[PDB]
């Protein structure tokens, strides 16, 4: 029914440039140039949209619906780092601050009367680390139950071991369903 997508604005991301030589027939070397943020440079910015493919027009431009980042994320640079559909009408999103030790999950429902996506803040789930960064390389992906009211996700426990945790959409804690030295 729905097609979600990200949009990336690289306007002020500086370019890396380097020569490319090609077949020896090419008389002057080509300069490849690529938006590429080196450490501490200016990053891309991101936006997220969902569109309903069932109500597409051919007489009207398609309405794309934006889902803004969480406010906690908006006060500085951040990343969109996971998107995972939960039901036919529920989508989950994970954001990550440029200082990658704080991340937030949004859980968004389609809203029949408005036709936008409601992200109940009650349903947010903060995740952070004091000893390093979040996730092995990024926050882990959630796996939802069929009705999409709960999900499992790999998070590091307090002994520091990555185990499967069990979440309820609106309850703020979770339950580890595995523990061990592994």
């Amino acid at each position: 029914t729905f097609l979600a997508y990200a949009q990336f604005n690289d306007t002020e991301v500086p370019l890396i440039e380097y020569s490319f030589y090609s077949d020896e027939s090419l008389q002057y070397p080509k300069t490849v140039r690529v938006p590429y943020p080196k450490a501490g440079a200016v990053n891309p910015t991101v936006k997220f949209f969902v569109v309903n493919t069932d109500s597409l027009s051919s007489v009207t431009n398609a309405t794309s619906i934006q889902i803004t980042a969480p406010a906690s994320m908006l006060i500085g640079d951040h990343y969109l780092c996971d998107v995972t559909w939960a039901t036919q009408e529920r989508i989950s999103l994970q954001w990550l601050r440029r200082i990658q030790n704080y991340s937030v999950m949004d859980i968004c429902d389609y809203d029949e009367s408005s036709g936008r996506w409601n992200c109940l803040v009650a349903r947010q789930h903060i995740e952070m680390s004091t000893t390093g960064w979040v996730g092995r390389f990024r926050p882990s992906e959630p796996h939802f139950t069929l009705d999409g009211n709960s999900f499992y996700k790999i998070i590091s426990n307090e002994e520091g071991y990555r185990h499967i945790c069990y979440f309820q959409i609106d309850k703020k804690d979770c339950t580890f369903i595995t523990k061990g030295t592994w």
Binding site: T68, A71, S72, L74, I75, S114, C119, V121
Partner: protein, 352 residues
Amino acid sequence: TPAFDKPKVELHVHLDGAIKPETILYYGKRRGIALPADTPEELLNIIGMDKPLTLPDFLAKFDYYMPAIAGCRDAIKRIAYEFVEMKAKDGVVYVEVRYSPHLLANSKVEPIPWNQAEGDLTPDEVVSLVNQGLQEGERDFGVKVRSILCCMRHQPSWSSEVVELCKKYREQTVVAIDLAGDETIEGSSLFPGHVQAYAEAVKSGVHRTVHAGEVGSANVVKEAVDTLKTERLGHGYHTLEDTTLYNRLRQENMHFEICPWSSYLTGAWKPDTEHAVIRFKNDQVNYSLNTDDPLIFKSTLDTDYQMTKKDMGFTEEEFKRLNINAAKSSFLPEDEKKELLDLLYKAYRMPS
């Protein structure tokens, strides 16, 4: 020194007027909206007053920055959040924030404001964004936050929607309807669209406050209480020009949202007089200390407590009881009003 370094309660503050220079500046650059400065600090001066000018010159400050914020989802949800933080930076333990949702929208708006183009952001969604910006502040910064949606005096057309939004978002932090803008517009308080909204407010259980008496006759107050049925009064200085109504208001326990530093700067208090407040103190009236538009007043909530302690010999015993009052007059359910008081009594040290 933190004039009154205890928990405080604030009831009269405009989101419109509590924004960070830095973040105005950010959305200016991002959207290419022209701005009269480039320093964050240079900007707080161009936007801020320190000479007590007048209500024309005050409303003119809004035009410097609002075009940069309105119609921009990313920005709204932000300022709402950043606001909660600045409240936590003052003593504040509970806030009610007011703004006009129409003044921040750019789609579906009677006269599309701030001379901005159409138009993606509907007012219904502005309100929605705001809630979330606040919820995320309440959680993170640890101050309980509710919102008040403003009707605008010169725009009775909107005031119908305002109350309707107030209704559906009663779960998501909106607790009351206000009416700001301009008292001195002739017979505003009687405009059918406005009064019918307030009628529906009474009907639906939506609490009610009104900007009245600030710069305007005691009669503006009369209108607000009588036909509008306001439970609380924004500013309300010049209600001391009718001792009958004034004394029947103390009788019926009316709450007066006072903005001391605001008054001086709006010119709604001519500095030759005793401030309308010292009388309120002495008359033991039900009132609270607020900040109004701290951005334009270059003020923190401490500025308004500094003023009353110094300029008019306000003691901590007074500060304590007016905050108890503010809490009593707050638009919380019975429920949380009890525990707000509990928090207050304990901090403070009196019987709970």
